[PDB]
Amino acid sequence: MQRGNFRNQRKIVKCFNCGKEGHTARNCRAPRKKGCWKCGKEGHQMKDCTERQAN
Numbered sequence: 210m211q212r213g214n215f216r217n218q219r220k221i222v223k224c225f226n227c228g229k230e231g232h233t234a235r236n237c238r239a240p241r242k243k244g245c246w247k248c249g250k251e252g253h254q255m256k257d258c259t260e261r262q263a264n
């Protein structure tokens with residue numbers, strides 16, 4: 210109990226994805242990066258997203 214975490218005045222918060230203040234990328238609503246725009250899955254660009262295999 211009372212593990213603690215953060216506690217300081219004049220906190221500085223700035224997102225790494227969109228660059229705006231008051232939040233972090235975990236809390237952000239900007240489009241998800243580092244993943245395909247055509248299927249939504251991680252680890253590739255959508256030109257490597259060739260026809261999908263059966264099951």
Ligand SMILES: [Zn+2]
Pocket residue numbers: 224225226227228229232233234237238239
């Ligand atoms: Zn953001």
Ligand SMILES: [Zn+2]
Pocket residue numbers: 245246247248249250253254255258
């Ligand atoms: Zn894809």
